[PDB]
Amino acid sequence: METVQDCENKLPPSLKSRLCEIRRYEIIEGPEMDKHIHCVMRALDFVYEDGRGDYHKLYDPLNIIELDKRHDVNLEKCIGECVQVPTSERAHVFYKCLLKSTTGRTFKKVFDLMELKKAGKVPQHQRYTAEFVQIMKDYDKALNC
């Protein structure tokens, strides 16, 4: 429905100048950030309305790129935490927690892939390849990043 691009188009002036930090997965505290990240996590279909992580949107994608028993653990852990916080902070807390975990490495790849898939820049079965990395680099560079 509403693209990650659409969320970057609401960024309060304070945040718009730090777009490259955000798109680099650097952490910045809200609730300006709290509600942009809920925008993007919702746009890529990773969270519910209340902003809770969807285990089932991530488990298979994470494991296809890097097969690791840790994804299950991290997903359970991070969903746990996003549940004990308020619904304006929740999507952002699940995001943050994942990136800190050992699933961070692969979550970033799944996130990048889903962003470009949804934008129609890469096909649906696109894998995290050397070509894909360059595709994202050029994508980011068109955004001044």
UniProtKB/Swiss-Prot annotation:
One of its GO terms (molecular function) is odorant binding. Noradrenaline binds at residues 8, 23, 112, 115. It is found in: Secreted. SMART domains: PhBP. Changing residue 140 to L: Reduces serotonin binding and eliminates tryptamine binding. GO terms for biological process: sensory perception of smell; vasodilation. SUPFAM superfamilies: Insect pheromone/odorant-binding proteins. Serotonin binds at residues 8, 36, 95, 112, 115. Keywords: Disulfide bond, Secreted, Signal, Vasoactive, Vasodilator. Tryptamine binds at residues 95, 112, 115. One of its GO terms (cellular component) is extracellular space. Its main location: secreted. Female saliva (at protein level). Female salivary gland. Not detected in female carcass without salivary glands. Not detected in male tissues. InterPro entries: PBP/GOBP, PBP_GOBP_sf. Disulfide bonds join 7-39, 20-145, 78-97. Belongs to the PBP/GOBP family. Modulates blood feeding of female mosquitoes on vertebrate species by binding and sequestering different mediators involved in the host response. Binds serotonin, noradrenaline, histamine and tryptamine. Inhibits histamine-, serotonin- and partially noradrenaline-induced smooth muscle contraction. Exhibits vasodilating activity. This is Short form salivary protein D7R4. It comes from Anopheles gambiae. The lineage of its organism: Eukaryota, Metazoa, Ecdysozoa, Arthropoda, Hexapoda. The gene is D7r4.
